[PDB]
Amino acid sequence: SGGLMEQIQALLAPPKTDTQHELDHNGLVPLPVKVCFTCNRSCRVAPLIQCDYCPLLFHMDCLEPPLTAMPLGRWMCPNHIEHVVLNQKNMTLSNRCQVFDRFQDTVSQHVVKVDFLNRIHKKHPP
Amino acid sequence: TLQEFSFFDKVRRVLKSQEVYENFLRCIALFNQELVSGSELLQLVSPFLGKFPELFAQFKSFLGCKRIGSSYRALPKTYQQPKCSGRTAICKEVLNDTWVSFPSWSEDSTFVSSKKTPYEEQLHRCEDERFELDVVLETNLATIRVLESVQKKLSRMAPEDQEKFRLDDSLGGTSEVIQRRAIYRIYGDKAPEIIESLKKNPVTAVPVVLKRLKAKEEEWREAQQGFNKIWREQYEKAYLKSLDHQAVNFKQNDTKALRSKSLLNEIESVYDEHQEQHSEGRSAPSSEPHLIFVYEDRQILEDAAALISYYVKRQPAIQKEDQGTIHQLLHQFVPSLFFSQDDVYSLFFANNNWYFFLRLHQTLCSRLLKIYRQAQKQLLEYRTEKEREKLLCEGRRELRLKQPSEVELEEYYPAFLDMVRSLLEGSIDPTQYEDTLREMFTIHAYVGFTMDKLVQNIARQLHHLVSDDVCLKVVELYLNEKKRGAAGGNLSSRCVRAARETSYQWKAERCMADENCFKVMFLQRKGQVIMTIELL
Amino acid sequence: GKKKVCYYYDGDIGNYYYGQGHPMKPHRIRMTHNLLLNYGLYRKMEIYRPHKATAEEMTKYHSDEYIKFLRSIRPDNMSEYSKQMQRFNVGEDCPVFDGLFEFCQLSTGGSVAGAVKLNRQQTDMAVNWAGGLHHAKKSEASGFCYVNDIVLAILELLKYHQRVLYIDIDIHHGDGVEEAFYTTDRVMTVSFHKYGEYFPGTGDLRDIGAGKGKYYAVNFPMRDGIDDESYGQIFKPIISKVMEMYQPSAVVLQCGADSLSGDRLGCFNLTVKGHAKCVEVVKTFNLPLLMLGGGGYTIRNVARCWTYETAVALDCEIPNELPYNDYFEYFGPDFKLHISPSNMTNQNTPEYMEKIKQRLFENLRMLP
Ligand SMILES: [Ca+2]
Ligand SMILES: [Ca+2]
Ligand SMILES: [Zn+2]
Ligand SMILES: [Zn+2]
Ligand SMILES: [Zn+2]
Predict the structure, then answer these.
(1) Chain A hits for C356, Cβ within 8 Å
(2) Which domain covers residue B16, as residue numbers?
(3) In terms of domains, do B228 and B263 share one?
(4) What count of other Cβ atoms lies within 10 Å of the Cβ of residue C42?
(5) In chain B, how many domains are there?
(6) CATH code at B23?
(7) For Zn(2+) 3, which residues are the binding ones (chain A)?
(8) B179 and B278: one domain?
(9) How many CB atoms are closer than 10 A to CB B211?
């Protein structure tokens, strides 16, 4: 580790005075596989990023617009609804969360949602 | 009606999950509460159904302080903007006043081990070391020149005026700092007294300062000559290794990437992806191969065969009968499979071992071709550069090292093959082999760093390809079926013989019913051979 | 054709010392000049001595308080300005060294004199390698820069030119210049830079301007290891589209060399030829052009790059063999003008570049 810096600084001195969607440890595509939502390909082509709200894996290039770097924090996939809620940026996250939880207790609602769909679907309004 | 039920059936089938489907239902319900317009509704549903044109068309028919950007914040309105005295009309009308960006990081960050090799850091340290000495030397020399100029000016005027000459804190130069910096460096703590003497009485004080500066300049110059001698052969030992960013990673990554389990996984994953696509019913034809590789030269083929034969002929555990058998397999059967003995294809049904051998052989051939192309490019670039630099008037358009001759440049590739043979025999050390490769092919040399092991791997496959009755039965079945012409043939006659080909596949299924079965197609086109492998 | 260019160099710029171990070294300019002398490029070029810029000239963009602090601070009175030193971000990253105000004066004066020369139409090309400090803000120092001379040069250019186009090929994002002209349509700033856990942390794809200056600021974020082919493939079409939509009258080109391979702080994989291809492409459009320096922290590569671009701007061809000069031993062991790249992985895949280019094209089509 012989560097010349000490000798030069002495020579010039002044006089002064006195998890599952990743490659294995050895490196292998885990099986069974989970694929990107846009291309249906695994982590072998490119690393996959996992949305932390829904189980949708994505590729950094398969997005629109593509991500330039890895998202360090919690990332939101483009397949959710809070994006249209983000159109109005004045309101804080607590009101948004309470609005979402207004529909978080009857999550199925399948009969009523198909019913509302056909109710709107009628071309001539009632 | 039932059409809506069928639509919802196919959408929850295609989404393959309940959470994404429920998000879609939340979207349509939020629409149903009259908070969403039709165009906004389709722009929200586009992420879910952007890859099914049929589903999207069906859904369309069924329907019938402020912040901007990502890094700019608005300044407070009641914020005392710092006054400026030079603001002209263009300054007021043009300059930004309301938005600010906040720098999030700092330069000279933790980048020491982020992406750089250990041999770039030595070069950086040597460069810095050079710069510190050079900057001190050039400050001293500039001060010497300034004092020489002021002394020459002083010596030309009347003696009764010399005692009336004085100097300011620029000390005759154009800078108020640099000359004082040099004098401070020379004199340590006694610098202010010398500076006052130079400013007050230049006539008597200039020559002694000049003498001291000159003596220090000579001593520093000889020390720098010694340091220049030492700094060399560190650039030489570090330069080529600094540009090769992959060797350390590549050696281990390749020593793993060639294992049988890794090769098997590389195709099993693709098979699983295609199976999932078929399950989701996406528009993908059920005849495409899972993996595709290209052979672009026959000369590379016989070169690789010669290398493998060279290694196998020097084996102690392989008997003369097995040597002959491997010779027939390598120089006769394989070229026949590649049709060395358009739109002409060959069909082959193989087990795991033949798939491994084909993968390894393709890897070796591709690397040999890469080295060959690099050598050709180097020779062409050298010839073009010589032709260009011969015709140069340079500035009229208003030691070193001796580069190799053209003959060495065209003999690089046979020398590379001889080097590979020497490494395989064990006569040359891996370190010297790697160094010669790096000096021969610069940053494309790593491609050949782990060739011998690769060859070794291939050899093992060949040996097993003789000892396992399954493999010889496979090649015999291929030969017997080709005698009928069903396995492989002209592209047009496929539909003529297709049923017969089916029979062949059937036999494969009843010969390896406990083992993976691979369909391999060798398609010839324009001098290249495309090997397409698919797992059954 | 062959045209008259102006060169600005002050012999004292190489002596200013940033500090021990600091990546920023003005010495590079000196070596660059030395190379220009040993290729015989002084005969076809006009060399000027830049006049020092008065503080009144600098206060056209910077506040008087920040300039007064810069003119007053010295290494021997750091104790009496500590609070101010915290306020203006003068400290660790941007240190206070001996004669920093004179350094700022020379660097600013070179580019301001070049801009004045271009305004007077006495030339259509001015070169100042001491300039190119684009990270400095209105009342703070950032990214080794204390005074933003690019903004001052553009403010000088705006007195005769209606539209001024600024191009930045330094690996970092030129946040100071972009922020200075964020809400105006008379200056459009194109920046190509690395993005993501990198200084200064700005310059997103969606930073397109504000107010009247909307769609007049374009950023191309990149990944590690971009090389000559990708850079050439995405620089020429974007610049052609920018010049066809915007139709500028003057061009300011920041030629920072920290985007070359082997840089002490950069991550890219460009070479000298690929770097100067941008200069050739810009020069093709035949506009009053001001070329500036900037970053670059592998000193020998900076010298090579800037001497090659100076040769290219003169339409002069120079041999690949480096002539003997005062700093010859810096260029071992090959002693060649051109440099070789590494084999680092190019993380910018073709689909990423195509998508970003398409987004930029759709952003550009919206200009009037
Ligand atoms: Ca940039
Ligand atoms: Ca603008
Ligand atoms: Zn994908
Ligand atoms: Zn999601
Ligand atoms: Zn930079």
Answers:
(1) 65-66
(2) 2-63
(3) no
(4) 15
(5) 3
(6) 1.20.1160.11
(7) 36, 39, 59, 62
(8) no
(9) 10
